[PDB]
Amino acid sequence: NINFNTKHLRKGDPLPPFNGKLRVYNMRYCPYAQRTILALNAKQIDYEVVNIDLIDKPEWLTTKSAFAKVPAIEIAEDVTIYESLVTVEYLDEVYPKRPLLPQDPLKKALDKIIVEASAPIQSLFIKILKFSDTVNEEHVAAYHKALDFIQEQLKNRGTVFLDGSEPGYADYMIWPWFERLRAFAHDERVRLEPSKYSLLLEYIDNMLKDSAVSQYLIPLEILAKFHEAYTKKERPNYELLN
Numbered sequence: 001n002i003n004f005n006t007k008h009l010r011k012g013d014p015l016p017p018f019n020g021k022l023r024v025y026n027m028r029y030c031p032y033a034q035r036t037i038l039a040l041n042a043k044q045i046d047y048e049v050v051n052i053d054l055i056d057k058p059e060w061l062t063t064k065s066a067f068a069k070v071p072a073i074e075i076a077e078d079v080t081i082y083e084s085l086v087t088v089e090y091l092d093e094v095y096p097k098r099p100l101l102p103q104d105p106l107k108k109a110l111d112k113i114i115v116e117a118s119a120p121i122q123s124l125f126i127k128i129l130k131f132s133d134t135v136n137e138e139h140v141a142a143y144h145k146a147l148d149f150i151q152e153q154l155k156n157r158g159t160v161f162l163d164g165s166e167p168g169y170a171d172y173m174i175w176p177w178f179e180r181l182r183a184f185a186h187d188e189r190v191r192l193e194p195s196k197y198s199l200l201l202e203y204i205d206n207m208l209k210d211s212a213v214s215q216y217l218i219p220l221e222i223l224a225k226f227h228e229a230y231t232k233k234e235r236p237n238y239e240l241l242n
């Protein structure tokens with residue numbers, strides 16, 4: 001029912017009036033904002049998306065998102081939450097069905113640790129994307145430590161997904177970087193050796209089939225095109241899907 005690909009709004013664009021639907025201030029290619037989409041999808045919460053041009057930001061953005069970042073959710077008129085993990089934790093507390101976070105505090109903590117474990121991945125991706133020349137071997141090594149740790153958590157838990165037979169917070173909150181890893185899979189510093197990472201590669205295949213993931217997937221040729229702008233220092237085209 002939801003259109004993920006309405007125009008990204010720029011300075012001079014009007015602010016659509018609140019209409020009752022929970023609203024996400026998003027940008028289609030933002031992995032951080034993707035966390036909020038995944039959560040909303042998995043929990044089957046009705047919502048609407050307002051896309052934001054991050055190069056030429058709407059004047060009224062900081063009104064909704066103090067740090068001028070995405071995502072932000074608006075849960076009522078002029079009442080907003082931002083910071084991706086903050087938004088997801090709010091939705092999990094207020095919408096009880098399909099709980100993303102473990103109820104047991106210890107298990108909850110482990111999930112958050114796992115998410116933190118993906119920082120080196122988040123880091124390598126943004127470096128390769130925007131500061132590619134500065135990418136050294138500590139970055140690449142840290143990234144591999146990151147993958148090792150995550151795979152091992154999955155191995156130890158023995159389940160299909162980090163959070164069980166259905167993906168949960170840990171899965172969804174790291175997923176966007178795995179979605180992106182797929183498009184970096186022919187840069188040599190990212191490609192995964194299939195013996196070492198066969199369990200992780202299998203998990204990624206299964207994630208692609210989760211309906212919260214699949215309905216929001218970016219076709220890989222589109223994502224590569226998008227990334228291309230950055231590596232050339234071009235002005236982003238936010239409308240490739242529209």
Ligand SMILES: N[C@@H](CCC(=O)N[C@@H](CS)C(=O)NCC(=O)O)C(=O)O
Nearest residue numbers: 030031032054069070071083084085
């Ligand atoms: N810690 C924040 C970070 C989110 C973030 O970095 N959003 C980026 C987009 S990928 C952004 O809005 N950058 C604003 C800019 O272009 O200055 C979160 O988890 O929500």
Ligand SMILES: [K+]
Nearest residue numbers: 030031032126
């Ligand atoms: K980014």
Ligand SMILES: [K+]
Nearest residue numbers: 032069122126
């Ligand atoms: K960033």
Ligand SMILES: [K+]
Nearest residue numbers: 221224225228
């Ligand atoms: K390309």
